């Protein structure tokens, strides 16, 4: 089951790390590959979710947990496709 | 405010990661989980000045190649760590040296040699003077020992780096 490299921002860490993820698995998934990366660093961590930016032809939106990574196509105008990790509650 | 794109550069496990998260959050990763690419932003006071710091935690691979042209056009200052522990990282560092030189065109590049993991003294295979000669080697570069574990001249590291850029 082979992997996709993405980076992810952190705002409210003001850092960002380039992880490995599976396309194929659900976004809570990659949600929790991003907390195993922070390593309890990032305070009330279930808060977060990933997040897509907005791009071109495209508004940016938190992405749903129960969907699949893969059904959501990566912001073209970047070498490694882009998402966010932001509070909601 | 001045911000600065510092790259920490060399061989995997010689504690780019570990020097770079003890500067940005004070603390010592004992794990080694390896590094695709990392950036910290953090605001110093560096000569009574604000500076925003952007520091790039590359991996220790030839995977990746791409991004590393990307980081070496783009980095200002760069961090060759070496581990004391291990000769061929250091050996290894030669290398890299010349090819930020290639890829910025200068050798007017600012850039620091770093021994780190100088808390593991009976294990030591690469003496001081080894790094002593590679600096002055390199048209006298900028030199320390470090240790991340210790917090032995972490910030050192990068605030030469940034008075280098201003310099
Ligand atoms: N004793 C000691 N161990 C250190 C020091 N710095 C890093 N280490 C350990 O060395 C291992 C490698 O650390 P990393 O910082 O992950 O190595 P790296 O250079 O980042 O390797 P990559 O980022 O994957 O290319 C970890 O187990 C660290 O705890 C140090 O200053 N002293
Ligand atoms: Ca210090
Ligand atoms: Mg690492």
């Not at chain 1, 808060?47 to 907005?54: A, E, T, W």
């Not at chain 2, 770093?114 to 009976?122: A, F, H, Q, R, T």
């Given at each position: 089951?082979?992997?996709?490299?993405?980076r992810?921002?952190?705002?409210?860490?003001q850092?960002?790390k380039?992880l490995r993820?599976?396309?194929?698995?659900?976004?809570?998934?990659?949600?929790?590959?991003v907390?195993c990366?922070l390593?309890?660093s990032?305070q009330?961590?279930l808060?977060?979710?990933?997040?897509?930016?907005?791009s071109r032809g495209?508004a940016?939106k938190?992405?749903?947990e129960?969907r699949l990574?893969?059904?959501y196509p990566?912001?073209?105008?970047?070498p490694?496709?882009?998402?966010?990790?932001?509070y909601?509650? | 405010?001045?911000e600065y794109?510092?790259?920490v550069?060399?061989?995997?496990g010689?504690?780019?990661?570990?020097?770079?998260?003890?500067?940005?959050?004070?603390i010592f990763?004992?794990?080694?989980?390896?590094?695709?690419?990392?950036?910290?932003?953090?605001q110093?006071?560096?000569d009574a000045?604000q500076?925003?710091?952007?520091?790039?935690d590359?991996?220790?691979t030839?995977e990746?190649?791409?991004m590393?042209?990307?980081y070496?056009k783009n980095?200002?200052?760069?961090?060759?760590?070496?581990?004391?522990?291990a000769?061929?990282?250091?050996?290894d560092?030669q290398?890299?040296?010349?090819?930020?030189?290639?890829?910025?065109?200068?050798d007017?590049?600012p850039?620091?040699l770093?021994?780190?993991?100088?808390?593991?003294?009976?294990?030591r295979?690469?003496?001081?003077?080894q790094?002593?000669?590679?600096?002055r080697?390199?048209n006298?570069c900028?030199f320390?020992?470090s240790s991340?574990?210790?917090?032995?001249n972490?910030?050192?590291?990068?605030?030469?780096?940034?008075?280098?850029i201003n310099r």
């Open positions: 089951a082979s992997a996709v490299v993405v992810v921002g952190i705002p409210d860490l850092q960002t380039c993820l599976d396309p194929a698995a659900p976004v809570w998934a990659a949600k929790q590959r907390l990366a390593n309890h990032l009330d961590a808060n977060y979710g990933l997040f897509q930016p907005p495209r940016g938190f992405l749903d129960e990574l893969q059904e990566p912001n073209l105008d970047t490694l496709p882009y998402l966010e990790f932001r909601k509650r | 405010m001045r794109k510092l790259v550069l060399g061989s995997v010689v504690g780019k990661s570990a020097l770079t998260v003890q500067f940005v959050q004070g990763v004992e794990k080694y989980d390896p590094t695709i690419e990392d950036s910290y932003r953090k110093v006071e560096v000045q500076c925003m710091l952007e520091i790039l590359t991996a220790g030839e990746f190649t791409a590393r042209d990307l070496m980095g200002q200052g760069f961090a060759l760590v070496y581990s004391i522990t000769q061929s990282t250091f050996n560092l290398d890299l040296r010349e090819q930020i030189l290639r890829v910025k065109d200068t007017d590049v850039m620091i770093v021994g780190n993991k100088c808390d593991l003294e009976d294990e295979v690469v003496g001081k003077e790094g002593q000669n590679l600096a080697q390199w006298n900028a320390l020992e991340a574990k210790s917090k032995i972490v910030n050192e590291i990068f605030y030469d780096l940034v008075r280098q």
